[PDB]
Specification:
Blueprint (H helix, E strand, L loop, with lengths): L4 H11 L4 H11 L2 H20 L3 H13 L2 H11 L13 H5 L15 H10 L6 H20 L2 H11 L5 H17 L8 H13 L7 H17 L3 H14 L2 H12 L3 H18 L2 H4 L5 H18 L2 H6 L1 H4 L5 H15 L10 H6 L7 H20 L7 H25 L3 H5 L1
Helix pairs in contact: 1-3, 2-4, 3-4, 3-5, 5-7, 8-10, 9-11, 10-11, 10-12, 11-12, 11-13, 13-15, 14-17, 15-20, 20-22
């Protein structure tokens, strides 16, 4: 550096005059340490002018090409020029390989400590950057990973840190393919755990492909990847899933579940996650009843019905948690009753406990208090239905009567058989 550096700034203040400055801009460089000091300004000016296009273009292109044929310099180069690749279309050692997402052939940073690769990786961590440059860097790492597998944790971290901001079909394709390739390389072993990161990436990718041909193949491949990841770190899989469900917002969780199912990997996921999903939902009812989220609430209905429809034997285990999860533990029972109350007020009044469960609830080897609470909660539900206020949403009204009568018949039969547990439970 020298006191002359102000001159360079004076040139930049023309681009940030349009014709005149290029003259000295060329001359001073055409006529090495000064050249190193001047390179960043050359980059800024040439990139700005080239992007302002919807003779100076050619002169500055030739200047840059002569300039190219320290880390911050290549960082800046990629940061500004990566999105321009598709726009510099006709006019080569750099541009022709770069259209193909390969290392540009210039010896300054094609060198190995890899310099271009570390530069682009460092740039990809930036939160705000051109979408085109992000696609380009992703395709570049896809190509490089494919080559590496033909014959890295920070790569995963970069993919994760980009994935959260936004996704597009192109992004989901490239991201799934890269993650699959790193799994094949075996970056995950057989703070932040690698397994957690990978699973989060899969979840986020699959969150935006709700299926209620092009999508079908990609979904199949995603499912295959999920199965592959499944065999690795079983307990960690369960734990991280249970963490994520509570972590992310309800909207995200429900959307992801819809995408996965649409209304085994899915069986394990559901049986690991549904308890925590219901537990979180339980202490949210007042907020969720608010009309702005009504539609969201509606969705949950379907979801729960599907879990009951033919999938979840776990549904019984969650609904009856209050007395399967057992001085008495008052808190566990209270949580179980919150879950049961939420489920009972959710769907198909009089469907959730079947007659058989209630009839057998007399002899279950669980704390009497929990059984009595279950009976009283059923009682309160029936009373509310009778008084007029059903769940805030008909043939269902007539349907519920048969379910109630079935409950009554079952309970009466059981009581008769037994008499012909304490008295208080019978009274409940």
């Amino acid at each position: 550096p020298l006191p002359i550096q102000t001159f360079l700034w004076r040139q930049t203040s023309a681009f940030l005059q349009y014709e005149a400055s290029c003259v000295s801009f060329e001359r001073v460089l055409v006529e090495w340490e000064l050249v190193q000091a001047a390179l960043p300004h050359v980059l800024h000016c040439t990139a700005t002018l080239l992007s302002n296009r919807n003779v100076a273009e050619t002169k500055l292109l030739h200047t840059l090409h002569w300039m190219l044929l320290s880390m911050a310099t290549v960082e800046l180069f990629v940061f500004l020029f990566a999105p321009l690749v598709h726009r510099i279309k006709e006019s080569l050692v750099i541009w022709q390989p770069m259209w193909e997402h390969r290392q540009p052939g210039v010896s300054g940073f094609t060198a190995l400590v890899t310099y271009f690769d570390v530069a682009v990786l460092r740039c990809l961590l930036q939160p705000h950057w051109s979408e085109e440059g992000t696609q380009w860097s992703l395709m570049y790492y896809l190509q490089r990973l494919r080559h590496m597998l033909e014959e890295l944790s920070v790569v995963l971290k970069a993919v994760y840190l980009v994935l959260n901001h936004d996704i597009s079909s192109r992004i989901c394709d490239v991201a799934l393919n890269i993650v699959e390739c790193l799994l094949q390389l075996g970056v995950v072993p057989c703070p932040v755990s690698n397994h957690r990161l990978a699973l989060t990436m899969l979840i986020k990718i699959v969150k935006s492909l709700g299926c209620a041909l092009r999508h079908q193949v990609f979904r199949e491949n995603a499912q295959n990847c999920l199965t592959k990841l499944y065999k690795l770190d079983k307990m960690q899989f369960r734990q991280t899933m249970r963490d994520y469900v509570n972590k992310d917002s309800l909207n995200n969780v429900v959307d992801f579940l819809h995408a996965l199912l649409g209304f085994n990997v899915e069986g394990i996921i559901v049986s690991a996650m549904f308890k925590s999903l219901i537990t979180r939902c339980a202490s949210t009812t007042h907020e969720l009843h608010s009309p702005e989220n009504l539609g969201l609430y509606c969705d949950i209905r379907q979801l729960v019905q599907f879990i009951k429809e033919a999938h979840g034997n776990v549904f019984r285990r969650v609904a009856l948690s209050a007395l399967l999860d057992s001085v008495v533990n008052l808190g566990a029972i209270r949580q179980g009753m919150k879950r049961f109350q939420f489920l009972l007020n959710c769907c198909e009044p009089g469907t959730i406990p079947d007659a058989s469960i209630l009839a057998a609830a007399l002899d279950l080897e669980a704390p009497v208090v929990a059984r009595a609470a279950l009976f009283l909660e059923c009682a309160r539900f029936v009373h509310r239905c009778n008084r007029g206020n059903w769940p805030e949403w008909q043939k269902l009204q007539w349907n519920a009567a048969k379910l109630f009568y079935q409950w009554g018949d079952a309970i009466g039969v059981r009581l008769n058989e037994l008499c012909h547990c304490p008295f208080a439970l019978k009274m409940a």
